[PDB]
Amino acid sequence: TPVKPNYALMFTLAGHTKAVSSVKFSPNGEWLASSSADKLIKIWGAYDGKFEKTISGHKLGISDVAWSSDSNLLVSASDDKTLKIWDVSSGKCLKTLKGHSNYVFCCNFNPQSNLIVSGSFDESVRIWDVKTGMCLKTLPAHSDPVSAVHFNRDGSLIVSSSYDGLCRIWDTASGQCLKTLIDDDNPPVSFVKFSPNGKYILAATLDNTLKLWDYSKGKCLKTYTGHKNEKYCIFANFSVTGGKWIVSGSEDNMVYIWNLQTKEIVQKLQGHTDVVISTACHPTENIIASAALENDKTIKLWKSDC
């Protein structure tokens, strides 16, 4: 018999006054962090949906946020051209990272969490030292806005994606390009991420398509379709707490879930009233966090038995 999860809405979290841009579960699984165009970052209880606190400081909208390995720090990417490192406990800004000449769009800590990688509209990828806040390297990674940046599991690699239609893998230590995985220019690559085991790369293009690439071989293994995505840089995820699924937001206001192997859509989550720009999968539970744009502004938490 075949398996299909049965995610069902547990909570709806309201509070942001503008479209939500990104949601991320703390590695320890107790928190859900959310960023919004309202220039705020809010902290919520992953299991009770209970609002915890608001963290402010950016002068403009935030496009992305990311947790440190110990769930103690948070880094944010904003249109004010800076990234800010925050102490979640106190909610205060520890460092403001300055260098980008345009909107900072994406960010991530490396597994060690002593480094931060950022992607900007200025077309560069920058690597920052967490303790000092100094910029160690600036990579002329692309010829158009950088949509995503992510470290592989041992932190030796960085994967970037861009509107220039490319996906490049970089050597963290040297900052040199190890490979241009997606070579065609156009369609815009709106999102990239390494698989939990660091062997694959999940990439989304603005042609309603998600693809699983075998990094070492440089070849496409799986394609996932059926959802809508031609306008926004939507976050996509690997779900491995139960059945191995591919999770993603969509421009038709729903959350799509695919069987990773068969590539078949196994469930579509309804409830949001606007584009689901971001989705996140709990690190230990079969829980999904989803967030929507302007006509919704809410974050929904879903749970299944798998």
């Binding site: 503008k18 479209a19 939500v20 841009s21 990104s22 919004s36 165009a37 909208g61 496009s63 992305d64 249109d79 909107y103 769009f105 509209f121 306008k231 926004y232 840089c233 720009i277 744009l293 302007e294």
Partner: peptide
């Protein structure tokens, strides 16, 4: 601005 096109 990830929220805008």
């Amino acid at each position: 601005a990830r929220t805008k096109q």
